[PDB]
Paper text:
[name] (Exo I) from E. coli is an Mg2+ ion dependent exonuclease, which specifically degrades single-stranded DNA (ssDNA) from 3' to 5' in a highly processive manner. It is involved in several important DNA repair systems in E. coli, such as RecBCD-dependent homologous recombination, methyl-dependent mismatch repair, and genomic tandem repeat maintenance. According to the two-metal ion mechanism, two magnesium ions are essential for exonuclease activity, with MgB binding directly to the enzyme and MgA binding via the 3' end of the bound ssDNA substrate.
A flexible region (residues 350–359) missing in the structure is predicted to behave as a linker to join the SH3-like domain and C-terminal domain. Residues at active site and anchor site, both of which are involved in substrate binding, are highly conserved among MszExo I and E. coli Exo I. A single magnesium ion (MgB) was observed at the active site, coordinated by Asp11 and Asp104. The superposition of MszExo I and E. coli Exo I yields RMSD value for α-carbon atoms of 0.98 Å over 358 residues. E. coli Exo I exhibited a cooperative two-state transition at 49.0°C (Tm) while MszExo I followed a non-two-state transition with calculated Tm values at 53.1°C and 57.4°C.
Numbering used by the authors: 4 to 173, 176 to 349, 357 to 479
Amino acid sequence: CCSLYWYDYETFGTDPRRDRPAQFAGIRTDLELNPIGEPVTLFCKPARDVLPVPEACLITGITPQMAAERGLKEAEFITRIHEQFSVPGTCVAGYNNIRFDDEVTRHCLYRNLFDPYEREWRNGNSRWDIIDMLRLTRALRPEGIEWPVDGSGKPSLRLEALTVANGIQHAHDALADVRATIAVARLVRERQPKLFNFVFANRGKREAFELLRFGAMQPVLHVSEKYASDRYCLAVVVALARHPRNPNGVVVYDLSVDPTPLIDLNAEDLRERLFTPASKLPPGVERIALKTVHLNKCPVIAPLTALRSQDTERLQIDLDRCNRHLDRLKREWTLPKKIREAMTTDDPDLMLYDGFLGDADRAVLKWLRGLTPDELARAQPSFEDARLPELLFRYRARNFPETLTPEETARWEAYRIRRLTVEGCGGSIVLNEYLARIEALEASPDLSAKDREILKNLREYAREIIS
Ligand SMILES: [Mg+2]
């Protein structure tokens, strides 16, 4: 008895690690994509160490004042989301959620004393994202769907362009985005049900690994944001090695690129070119066409035999050339080891991926969360993980500031102000940039009345937050 929970954030900036959520929209559906129960819509009050990015507030229309006025404390905000997410059998899905919104969720759970991952895998739960399914559909079975292009003819998967081009539309608040996501998913399910079921059924770690055929040197299709839109985000790849550090990474080679440099260079030169940003490569030297597949992120892979002859022709795929390159790679006994060889703080808010929680810590965290604000002030717990002490403090200071001692309040105030004002103290943006970016935006000739009010609100928020 499983369900799909579709969601989206509007946030105060584009850095999931540092910029906090402002709005959440959620809609649960059955596996037919028909809604169950009511949509959820929540605002999150910004804690008093938050400085939003001006441009984001203009795009969303959401000021810190609006969020404070209509929202919940972050603890309750995330607890209500966590409730919906952790209902057994729930697959939590969205549109580009895995590489953005889910990171916002992980960091938010983390700060608020939840395990960042349990909602993703316990009690039959899982994740999904439709963006790579759409990339595969457009690349491999585009029939029956209008694939929009922008003004200069470049391909676009933007939610609004896609929905209008296919006549399933009906502004950018989170709720409209979520409903448009569900509708786009329905459209794929209707026009290409077999692909839809293939991608969905194969979305998990185990199943994605199996599709890679590691290590039979079998070429497969892989779609990714990292491959060029001019090639429909698709490449013919082969899995060559497990990633040295990331246990969920498999490194794959784009068989359209001459592998001579990968074969000929030593481990030192290979590491060098592989860590040189493409912009900084010398002239005549292209990049090493290796790419990491993150098995835990619902990567989309299909067998080479999914190509019909019109698809190969349409995608301008040279199978012989790929085969020729594959032959050369099969001959190198040492290549996997060489690849693995070539590929090899402080702030608790920035240390989510520094290590996993123990079973013990998880238990004390749960107990602390069950307490009332008063009980929580008296707790005096003991942690195995070194990150949790300071982390517990900020959680109390942000959501329950009336619960602090006089000297605790002075500690919060020192941290709070220097996060708001000094570079590298947690925030993506500090007060002076915030004001400078407000100035830049104020100088433009094409501000709406609404834009001005928002920029006015932002000035007032900065004035108020430092007093
Ligand atoms: Mg979104």
